[PDB]
């Protein structure tokens, strides 16, 4: 962790286009739009509402470091993703077919690209059958 705690702060204040210790939530709506997102101001104010645990909106990484210091791979956020398959499960066992996973992948929430969702179920359907099991996916999401 000693080799990443220095150069990350170069990207932390990179959105403000200056040297100030600011996460720049007002300028994040221009930085992400320059990247090609262009969100609304309601979702933009919702970003640092839970990302920045301080509460101001622009920070010298109390929680911008803690956002990096949350690996999202241990057993505290591995069952919450495993519950997201359970909302789609019918008749138990994690039955989810490639057709049903493509049906739910390109339709709801924040949709993926077709070049992403076409190959997303590829490593989770190595047997080629009609059941993309959740345990074969969270094992791929174990390093996420």
């Amino acid at each position: 962790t000693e080799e990443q705690i220095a150069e990350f702060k170069e990207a932390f204040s990179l959105f403000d286009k200056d040297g100030d210790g600011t996460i720049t939530t007002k300028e994040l709506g221009t930085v992400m739009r320059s990247l090609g997102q262009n969100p609304t101001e309601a979702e933009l104010q919702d970003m640092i509402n839970e990302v920045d645990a301080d509460g101001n909106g622009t920070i010298d990484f109390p929680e911008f470091l803690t956002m990096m210091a949350r690996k999202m791979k241990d057993t505290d956020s591995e069952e919450e993703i495993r519950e997201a398959f359970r909302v789609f499960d019918k008749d138990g066992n994690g039955y989810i077919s490639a057709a049903e996973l493509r049906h739910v992948m390109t339709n709801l929430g924040e949709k993926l690209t077709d070049e992403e969702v076409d190959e997303m179920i590829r490593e989770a359907d190595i047997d080629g059958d009609g059941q993309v099991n959740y345990e074969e996916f969270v094992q791929m999401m174990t390093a996420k």
Binding site: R86, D89, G92, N93
Partner: peptide, 21 residues
């Protein structure tokens, strides 16, 4: 009256996934 699984929503699955281990 077909929505009567509203006390045992996750309970029918939380035993079977335990049973598979």
């Amino acid at each position: 009256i077909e929505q009567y699984s509203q006390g045992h929503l996750n309970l029918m699955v939380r035993i079977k996934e335990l049973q598979r281990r």
